[PDB]
Amino acid sequence: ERGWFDILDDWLKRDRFVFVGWSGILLFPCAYLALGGWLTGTTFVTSWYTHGLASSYLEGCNFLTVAVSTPANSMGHSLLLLWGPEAQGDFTRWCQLGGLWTFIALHGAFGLIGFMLRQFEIARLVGVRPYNAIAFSAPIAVFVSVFLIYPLGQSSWFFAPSFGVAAIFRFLLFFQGFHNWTLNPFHMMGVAGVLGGALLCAIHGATVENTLFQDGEGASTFRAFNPTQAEETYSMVTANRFWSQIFGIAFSNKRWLHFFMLFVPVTGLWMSAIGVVGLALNLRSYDFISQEIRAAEDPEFETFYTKNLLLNEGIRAWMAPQDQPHENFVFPEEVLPRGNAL
């Protein structure tokens, strides 16, 4: 049977400069539209009607301050389809209401699905194991938990991260002030995975580069390697003795070493995602009850935990009126928490 399906399959899987595949039918339009929407919005589109913010090059923002901002809080969790009941097919209104945000987030989510399908598809054609796709589950878990689950637990898309450099910084600081997110052990595990992954990346790269066999005569050692050679290009034995004597322990199994390099950052990102799922419901690690009971009764008891909550309290009171304009917070000067003099 060589019908139209099989002929299409032939054309999709041609060895070309940019491989396409069946996954490409999902991947390429969604990736292109998510990226083009971000570029279109950061260049031309305002956040005046949803946030009270300028957010485009057209308005005078720079690369750090442009964003595609979330919709107004009054949209709730609306899909904000261009043809939906809010914009009613009006492209200019759609832009003013935050439609580009759900546009980017939703095409981005399906683009990510398409990229992971691409990893499966190419792996199956070339004959390799699909561990690259498996590792890519971690960025997907992060994207889905932060950009979809988190706002879906909150009141509206408004509290999702906006797509911009400084907008994401605001998101970090909001999470400190409101959620005490540095205190969360699921974030801590994520920090461990990311920093441990960066550590492993540096240390493996340097160890290989400093246990190389002399396989050529030049002072540039890069040339003395051939992709099809059968020999290891560096000494696992010498590397093992170095770290055993420097650090006490060392890798001795090169397969374990490289699975571990997959394992550490992937696991950390997955742990951080779980904690953000909790924050969707405000299920925070905000306090230590034992600390609060002592400190309430004993005005001489002070720790770095209690010092940090006062910082959180400042963040909330000083940023909330501008950051949540739909709430109409009016905080007179006399209610604002402040230390002496400042």
Partner: peptide
């Protein structure tokens, strides 16, 4: 095309309140 304010159209001459959208289905 995009509905972006010009420098002279963020505010009315004497107002200082943002024209913030507050309804879902009458936002337009």
């Amino acid at each position: 095309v995009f509905g972006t304010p010009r420098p002279d159209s963020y505010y009315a001459q004497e107002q200082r309140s943002i024209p913030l959208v507050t309804d879902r289905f009458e936002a337009k």
